[PDB]
Amino acid sequence: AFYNITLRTNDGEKKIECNEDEYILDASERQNVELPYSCRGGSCSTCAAKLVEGEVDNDDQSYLDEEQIKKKYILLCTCYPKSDCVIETHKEDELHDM
Numbered sequence: 826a827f828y829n830i831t832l833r834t835n836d837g838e839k840k841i842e843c844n845e846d847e848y849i850l851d852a853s854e855r856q857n858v859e860l861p862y863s864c865r866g867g868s869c870s871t872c873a874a875k876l877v878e879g880e881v882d883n884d885d886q887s888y889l890d891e892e893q894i895k896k897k898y899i900l901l902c903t904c905y906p907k908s909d910c911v912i913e914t915h916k917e918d919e920l921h922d923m
């Protein structure tokens with residue numbers, strides 16, 4: 826199924842949908858909502874975001890440790906939505922300065 830993702834970016838709030846079988850980064854990009862990234866493989870911190878509400882499957886990621894995951898951080902390049910979500914983007918620095 827598809828879920829509606831509310832992206833709270835550094836340039837306002839944007840509404841985009843994403844198939845539960847695809848990554849949020851790719852879905853966002855085709856709907857013209859540019860998000861940060863670099864490796865696009867789940868092993869770095871560039872695409873870091875924070876889950877405000879909703880369920881996701883970000884098990885394909887590998888950079889974030891359990892402490893960061895518990896704090897709701899997710900890497901959008903490898904994150905599947907599992908319900909409607911409200912996500913804050915461009916959180917790499919926040920993550921870095923925890």
Ligand code: FES
Binds near residue numbers: 866869870901
């Ligand atoms: S762009 Fe590197 S983990 Fe997402």
Ligand code: NA
Binds near residue numbers: 860
């Ligand atoms: Na960019």
Ligand code: NA
């Ligand atoms: Na450092």
